[PDB]
Amino acid sequence: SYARVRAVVMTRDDSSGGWLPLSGLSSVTVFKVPHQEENGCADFFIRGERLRDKMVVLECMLKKDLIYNKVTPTFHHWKIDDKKFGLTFQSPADARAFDRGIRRAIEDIS
Amino acid sequence: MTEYKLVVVGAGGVGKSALTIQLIQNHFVDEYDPTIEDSYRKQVVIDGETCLLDILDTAGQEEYSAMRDQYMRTGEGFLCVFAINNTKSFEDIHHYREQIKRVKDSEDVPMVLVGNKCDLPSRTVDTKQAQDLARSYGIPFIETSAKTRQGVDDAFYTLVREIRKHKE
Amino acid sequence: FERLVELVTMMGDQGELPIAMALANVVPCSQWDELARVLVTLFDSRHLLYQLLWNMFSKEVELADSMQTLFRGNSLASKIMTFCFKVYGATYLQKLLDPLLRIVITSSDWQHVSFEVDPTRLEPSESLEENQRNLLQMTEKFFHAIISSSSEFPPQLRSVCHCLYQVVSQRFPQNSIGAVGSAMFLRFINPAIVSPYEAGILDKKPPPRIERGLKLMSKILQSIANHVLFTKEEHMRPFNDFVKSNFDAARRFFLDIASDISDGNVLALHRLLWNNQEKIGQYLRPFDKMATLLAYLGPP
Ligand SMILES: Nc1nc2c(ncn2[C@@H]2O[C@H](COP(=O)(O)OP(=O)(O)NP(=O)(O)O)[C@@H](O)[C@H]2O)c(=O)[nH]1
Ligand SMILES: [Mg+2]
Ligand SMILES: [Zn+2]
């Protein structure tokens, strides 16, 4: 993986008017799936599973034009067209390392 | 050297490309890449005469049937290929042969019936069936296997001999 | 009315579609071409098109030996898919390809445009380097018009490709989008590119020099869709750099279309039904119920 932290996934509620957990603490990973050969073009994803049951709670597909807002330390959110997703981290060191992972992941999109 | 324009026809998945590659490049392709139209050329000696083989690999997918009028118009010999584990494939040869005759405006167009994939242990078209169908057509029948390279030279060389008898 | 097609569209528990699946495995292969026409029009008339596609597509992937055998060759489900592309994307292809084709014929007939890139077939007067450029230019704007056509993709197909996307993903979750895009190009886009007249896009066949270029362009476009380099014909290798760069541009277009009518002719469905009715119950309620309607409504 490009980065691996433990955080709570956030989703903005339009009826609530703010960000809320999607209900658990998850391990969020950034990885690539090769299109053909392992050392070739690939797709990039953000994936998070709740630690209690290893159930996926968020799965994205990284894009070059993706905007990644870092409004406060230990809190990051982005946009995948209609839907909005976010993350709150347990420490800035985990938030900085997760930002470095997806920054290099977009650099490897091609 | 005289040019012999060969054309490979048949249903999709019978092994038209796999048979063509084993003749040209002498190796067996394990992948399934459905073709549109491929062209090849090979020089060889048959019965002592050195000649060029202009080989045309056609599309077995039925969506590309509108291309059949052209390669049947310019082709000289046709290698009708079917798979012995696909009974459908066996009966499709008819509709290819009828269109060849119609565009050639002839009842005697040289062609060979080829039953491919003879390496498999389960076959839905046994040998005596294809022999009787070839007698109905009046053309030779040859069993081939693009995997083990059995009869691949025999199938292509025999089609050339049918074009020689026709030219005389 | 005494005409009950419900029995055909009846769904068992777990959405079995018992009558159609039994009818699919017993009807001769000759009538497969119209059986897809009968079932698609009927289920679409009752807003059950997705149920028919979900059942037939599932059976294909289920019995397919590997991912490269998937929906290659002509089976009933393969006929159903091409029919849906036909009846829903005819206006889509027609308005997309016709402008580019008229620019290739009416314009550019002024010069001696040649797309011949096979050296052993090339006239001495023409140049290989020049014809190679001519092919890539035409292939480029054709490929660009297809990738940029996401906002004009009709919704019925977008439902067909997404339905095809999910069913294969159950057995091949890795790179399942590739199977959608290849069948999309192989069975829908490219056949109309090679033969525009027969597809109903043009009024007459293009000149012979254009027909050779369109055939070569569809070979390149298919390599891009299949995400495979040219490895057979030595004269198509010079284009490998072009197809290697446009791999993921088409992959993005496939990921786009794969993510979310007056019934006519008074189909003699019962004529299709009773001709193949013999021994429908070779399995392993409806057949008994069906026999009463068949006995009352005698075959025509
Ligand atoms: N066991 C076995 N498999 C074979 C043989 N010939 C071809 N195949 C398999 O048949 C499949 C399709 O082969 P291919 O040559 O692409 O068939 P095709 O006639 O080219 N199809 P298309 O008409 O679309 O071009 C591949 O899986 C190939 O490995 C053979 O002799 N034995
Ligand atoms: Mg082939
Ligand atoms: Zn790629």
Author numbering:
A (entry chain A): 13 to 34, 37 to 124
B (entry chain C): 1 to 168
C (entry chain B): 1205 to 1464, 1478 to 1501, 1513 to 1528
From the study:
Sprouty-related, EVH1 domain-containing (SPRED) proteins negatively regulate RAS/mitogen-activated protein kinase (MAPK) signaling following growth factor stimulation. The EVH1 domain of SPRED1 interacts with NF1.
Since the Q61L mutant of KRAS binds to NF1(GRD) with 5-fold higher affinity than wild-type KRAS, we carried out crystallization of the ternary complex using wild-type as well as the Q61L mutant of KRAS and solved the crystal structures at resolutions of 2.75 Å and 2.55 Å, respectively. The structure of the ternary complex obtained with the KRAS-Q61L mutant aligns precisely with the ternary complex structure solved with wild-type KRAS. NF1(GRD) shows an all-helical, crescent-shaped structure that interacts with KRAS primarily through its GAPc region, which forms the “belly” part of the crescent. In contrast, the residues that flank the GAPc region form the GAPex region present at one end of the crescent, which is the major interaction domain for SPRED1(EVH1), as proposed previously based on biochemical studies. The interaction between NF1 and KRAS appears to be stabilized mainly by polar contacts, including five salt-bridge interactions involving the following pairs: K1283(NF1) and E62(RAS), R1391(NF1) and E63(RAS), K1419(NF1) and E37(RAS), K1423(NF1) and D38(RAS), and R1325(NF1) and D54(RAS). Unlike the previously solved structure of the RASA1-HRAS complex in which a GDP-AlF3 module was used as a transition-state mimic, the ternary complex described here was obtained in the presence of a slowly hydrolysable GTP analog, GMPPNP (GppNHp), corresponding to a ground-state conformation of the NF1-KRAS complex. In the ground-state structure, RAS-Y32 occupies the position of the arginine finger NF1-R1276 (R789 in RASA1) that points away from the active site. Residue D1217 in NF1 forms a salt bridge with a conserved arginine (R24) in SPRED1, and the SPRED1 residue W31 forms hydrogen bonds with NF1 residues D1217 and M1215.
